[PDB]
Write a protein that binds this ligand. Sequence first.
Ligand SMILES: OC[C@H]1O[C@@H](c2nc(-c3ccccc3)cs2)[C@H](O)[C@@H](O)[C@@H]1O
Ligand SMILES: OC[C@H]1O[C@@H](c2nc(-c3ccccc3)cs2)[C@H](O)[C@@H](O)[C@@H]1O
Ligand SMILES: *Cc1c(COP(=O)(O)O)cnc(C)c1O
Ligand SMILES: *Cc1c(COP(=O)(O)O)cnc(C)c1O
Lengths: 810, 810
Amino acid sequence: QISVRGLAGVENVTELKKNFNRHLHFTLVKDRNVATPRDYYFALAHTVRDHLVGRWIRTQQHYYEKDPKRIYYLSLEFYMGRTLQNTMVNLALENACDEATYQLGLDMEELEEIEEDAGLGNGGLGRLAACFLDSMATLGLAAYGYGIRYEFGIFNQKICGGWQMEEADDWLRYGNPWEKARPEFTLPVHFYGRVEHTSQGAKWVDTQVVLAMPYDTPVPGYRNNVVNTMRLWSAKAPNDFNLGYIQAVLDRNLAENISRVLYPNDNFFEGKELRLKQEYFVVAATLQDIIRRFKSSTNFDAFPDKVAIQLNDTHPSLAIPELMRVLVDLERLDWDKAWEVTVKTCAYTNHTVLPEALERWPVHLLETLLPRHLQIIYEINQRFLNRVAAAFPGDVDRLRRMSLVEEGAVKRINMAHLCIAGSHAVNGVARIHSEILKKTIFKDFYELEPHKFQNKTNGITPRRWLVLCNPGLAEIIAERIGEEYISDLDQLRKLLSYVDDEAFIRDVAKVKQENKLKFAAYLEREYKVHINPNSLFDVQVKRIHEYKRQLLNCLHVITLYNRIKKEPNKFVVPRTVMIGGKAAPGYHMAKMIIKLITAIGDVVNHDPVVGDRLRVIFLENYRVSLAEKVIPAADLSEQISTAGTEASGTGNMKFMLNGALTIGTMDGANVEMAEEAGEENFFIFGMRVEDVDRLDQRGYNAQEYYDRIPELRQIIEQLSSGFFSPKQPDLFKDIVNMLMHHDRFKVFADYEEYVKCQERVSALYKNPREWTRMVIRNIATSGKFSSDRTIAQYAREIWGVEPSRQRLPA
Amino acid sequence: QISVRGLAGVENVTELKKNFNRHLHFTLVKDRNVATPRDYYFALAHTVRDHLVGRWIRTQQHYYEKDPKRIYYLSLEFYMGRTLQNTMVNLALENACDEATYQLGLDMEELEEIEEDAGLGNGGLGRLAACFLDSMATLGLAAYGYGIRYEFGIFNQKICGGWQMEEADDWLRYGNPWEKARPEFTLPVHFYGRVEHTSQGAKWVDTQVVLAMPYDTPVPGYRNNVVNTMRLWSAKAPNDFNLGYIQAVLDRNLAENISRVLYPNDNFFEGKELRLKQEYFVVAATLQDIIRRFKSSTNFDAFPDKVAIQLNDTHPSLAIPELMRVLVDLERLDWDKAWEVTVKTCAYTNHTVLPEALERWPVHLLETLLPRHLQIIYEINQRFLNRVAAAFPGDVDRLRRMSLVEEGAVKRINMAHLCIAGSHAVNGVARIHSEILKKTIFKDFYELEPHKFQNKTNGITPRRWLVLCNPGLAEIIAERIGEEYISDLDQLRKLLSYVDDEAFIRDVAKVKQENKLKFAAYLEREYKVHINPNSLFDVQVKRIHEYKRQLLNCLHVITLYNRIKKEPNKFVVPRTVMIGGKAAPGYHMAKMIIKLITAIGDVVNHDPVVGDRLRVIFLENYRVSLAEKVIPAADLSEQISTAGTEASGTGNMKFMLNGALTIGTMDGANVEMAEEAGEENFFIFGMRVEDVDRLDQRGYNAQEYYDRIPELRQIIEQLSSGFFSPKQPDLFKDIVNMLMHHDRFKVFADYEEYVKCQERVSALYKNPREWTRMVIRNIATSGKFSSDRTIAQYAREIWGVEPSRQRLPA
Ligand SMILES: OC[C@H]1O[C@@H](c2nc(-c3ccccc3)cs2)[C@H](O)[C@@H](O)[C@@H]1O
Ligand SMILES: OC[C@H]1O[C@@H](c2nc(-c3ccccc3)cs2)[C@H](O)[C@@H](O)[C@@H]1O
Ligand SMILES: *Cc1c(COP(=O)(O)O)cnc(C)c1O
Ligand SMILES: *Cc1c(COP(=O)(O)O)cnc(C)c1O
């Protein structure tokens, strides 16, 4: 049909069709009279996977011959989403498969919708890992993702009576056709035990063994015939485990619990033992694999020339003491040499400054579970604090503040401190966030080791986030400037010369209108709900958090409702306000916010006077596959975190790429997005970081805003009095009470500037041609936000490897 | 190589080789430089499985068009063993695969040895289910095996310090290439809840849901292109199960425990709740499937014309009240009509008379777990006891003895009584066992319903138990009388005309000698142990039990040892005495017997005076794949159960087929084996059933035998004084004490006749030509013991269906 989906060669289509029917028969053991849509999806998945196999074997082969430096991306989260369409895009098979399926009387879009999301992540951090693997394969780096094959990913969100309910994400029920189990590469992981000191050094004995069994998933580069590996570990009991008989066999589940379930907290620390077991499990099995591959090329001087280990936040921080333990206790290197190797091998990406997200593990937990690692951590701290003392003699306060060990009723290990000490590079994830790291939480470490601190601004893969989810926009761009931009997103600047072209203005607005029609139809077919596709689609999708200020959006929505009621017969730009996101199951306030959003919908969507001028929709089960549908349908992106709270964000970039204008704070990557597009092409409002600091020094009094802003007072009085909860008058007292007395994120302080800026948005939407010219200015400057840029900067400035766009042979 | 392994067509071999290399590449994602023997086995398994797929789809198709009466074999056990060689035998692929593998530089025998046993059974009963599926497919019956896919089968047995240790049988670790998951046919199963009575009858409410997910394994007939289905259910939690969050997800393991592990008790009842859940789970999911298939042809009059359900012992007895519950509570049939349907549908095979094996479930358990089934069971009992009262007026004792409910401190349900009441046919498993059922434990039921009671003597599949395990013997037989005997084992009688042929005498003895060489080499390569292949191989393999009297064999072995020591320089026929079997993990005495066997080995195998004239070997981890090696290597079969304890046995038949002479009691199928071969061709000794009865009436005094038999007294004194346990003098006091004061199985009563009969065996072994002529007389009359005979009798006399040897089209 469209050109960026590749050729449908006659030979190619014939070949796909016979292999589809071979897999239906031999793989699925179905005839065509009993097959379901689900069987057809599996037959297609197996057929497309066959095109990966040759390239995967060849790539791993090439890396063995050439022996390049290897990159190990350690993450507890890989938010992959669906694999089938992404595989077709990257092998140029998409049109051939459409044609092949079409001639067997099937619709490929319908079969795509049957694939389960691999939801092995919470949000931004997990999805950054996924975008990174795609960019690493596209830039031909010998790169490996290492994590955990959770049996249950992020929970499925149902809404009942407007409340979040959680269901187990049983994503493996029907089987994963993309993974290959490698039980032959199974490795032991140790827990508990105690430390014996001998003549021959320290010895970790009386341990409990858990087996780590790897599953390999292919990661295809973009049309370069590179296929990298994502290796996820599964927990298996050894067969003598607990070995009356029956109970011993049943208790194997204790050990296999380690890989059972993803912790569903976004940007929050829960100090639970099962989580610490997850963190050690992925690190212990991974390091053993890294060292085995290295030894298959005595001498660890070359280890850092052949190995880079990137830590995705502190979650795999134990990689540092584990590498020491292997090099010191097992390889019998002296401490100083092993430490040199560790520091030149490891680099740490910090993703947050929120204090409740920083991993601070109680010592009693580490003492019981990893006794040797705690000894190594103490040894690291003593030697690190000896270097601080020498550089800053007499600064005892510095010593206490920089310690890896926090004093307190409970002693804790600050894993962030461990990561800075044990890494040659520490990066934040947007320029403003990396600056905040040097000015505030890591100021002491910066002053000791200024050379370690870098910025690597986040990005998104334009493969999944443009070609895959928005083929129509991809195509009109490819008509003007060719295909090459897909692996070189900076080429989108050429679109600035098309900003006064009537034809291109018409095409950009037509694609947006087609995406909205398609998404409005999708809402009706799966959730029986009537929306106006001529309305402005105002979209805030992201995890539910106080810092992300879904509540500020709520206040705007109630303001528009109250203005309509005051003056019913006045014209307003119609809006569909869509908010979506999961709350962590234990996060009471995040659950109340979801409930308030649906409570507002219940009132405004059934007010006859409102008409179709204002609709409030809660998008259920926001996940990667819903993001691929709603982000292309969006007109306004809501990026409204309190300045200095959102380290980067990446949703922001997805929307810029897809033809939505941004309303946002000078927070995270929003700052660089505005800088790339021009501030005049961005709906900037609210406090800067400096303004929030000034408010903090003085004291935030929310009462002051309630007394001065009648529009705001009316909303607070409505919430209190049960305007939005008639049956439970006081349902929202916790929300009012937080906004009035303990708002860490200063929602009222930004209210007035938010509403005025939202008026500036409505005014521009009234002029389609100028709205669309501003959209073109956004899409055309979005190139910086390619994860290809990000990964090339990691490779050159951290890992010491040259990216490459050269094809391997097919 | 040999003719009964089929043709190696040039096209055929080429085709196997390209498909082997396709699966190695696309299925296993290996090149030939990194593949292991295990990869090669998987590539072959997938290649051979591809030949099943067409036949499987076609067969299930044919059964839908023709709509024959369907047979449902309900068992908690299917002891399948390995599938690969059996699949090749039944599709005539064996020589083509040997040739194909040979030309790729691989040895097929080496790859076969890598397959794990599917050990989903304890012994005879589980293996009878497996032989039955093979015979049902060979006789073209529309037959289905229904059971449980246990994650862990019968434990792996290790010996440490001569003691049994148990290891988890993790048979699915590397994947099962033979099964196909059918998660689309997933069915709910209910537990707990309570019964509400309404206008519209009884209602089972507030239940806990567990999902039953079916896995299908193909069952190929012998060269008839029929492939039947074995469907095993797996337990899965529903996704709202327990649905703080983490613990809810972890607690899904409670529900999935149901299909986790096979109970490892052979011919013993353990009244545990998890076992009752296993029994209901397989019955509830199976009946729903049976009824769905039936409705896809209102009216249940025809149900028994379209459905036979065979109960494999009482383990699925709940099929009876479950079928009532479905027909009465859900289909709203009146009680009398539903009962007619149930009785004409169900038939019950009894496998034992040992009182400790009979399932007697406490009422409090059934009350809590299956409240409605208990109400239906009470209703069955009341109506059944009303028919007893009418036929035997005033016989109140009969009423108490025949009740389905046993009175006692704990009330119990006698599941055997439930099965007789609810079945149109009740069979035992050998003529003597079926006679004992009518004379003793079911005498009352026989007098009420004489027409229900049948014999169906057990059999073994000559495919696995001759062609597969003993190709050499298969071939010399096929040279004289052709191939046709393999599906018509009665044709073995033609071998009686070859009993004076020198050539055939030489060939029978040559095959036996080759099997012994091959098995002696196997002992050295896997367990570093030196045995004389010129010695008589005296073999007792079967589960470790008091009733099977491994201890009587021990007493003989110690007798031979003491005779050698008394007269060292006298000639004795050399023997390798091999005993093998697992003990139930909780069966203290069975574990002591294993320990005594190894204790005897420790003494006799290191006595210089003994030389290689007597070796005692404990065969570790006796299982189906070890039976395929040792049974063809055997000279003497030990079948020495106390008369009236072994219902049938089936090991006995395996050895008769494979050229071993039998030493045994007139117990079980031994009686019919002797009758077929002639008593003069059988080493018959010991009490008959009548003799044991006479001893019981009088009282068994073991002291009398100890006082009268000096040879026996010496052995008891050796055991007591620590001759066999120098470091623990009193290790065996429990064994001595049992033999002297509480021997239920009268080991001393048979001692003297056993030793004399063993002397008659040694004397015949001295004359190879007459030993071999007696072997030919055994093999040639073994036809009756084909499971093809057994299944044809079930089909004609119980199920009301005509077997068939007609090929389906390929
Ligand atoms: O860099 C990728 C994204 O990382 C997000 C972060 N996630 C976590 C996080 C902690 C624990 C468990 C899951 C997740 C901390 S910061 C940050 O909140 C986002 O601003 C940023 O865009
Ligand atoms: O008919 C097949 C065989 O059945 C054996 C039997 N197994 C059981 C048995 C009970 C519970 C769990 C497993 C097994 C009872 S009788 C009998 O003990 C054998 O004699 C007989 O040959
Ligand atoms: C990109 C993405 C995120 C991160 O969005 P932010 O707005 O940066 O928090 C979260 N969830 C999903 C499903 C995503 O695709
Ligand atoms: C046949 C068989 C049995 C049953 O043997 P008996 O001697 O009848 O108890 C037990 N185990 C295995 C592995 C078998 O193959």
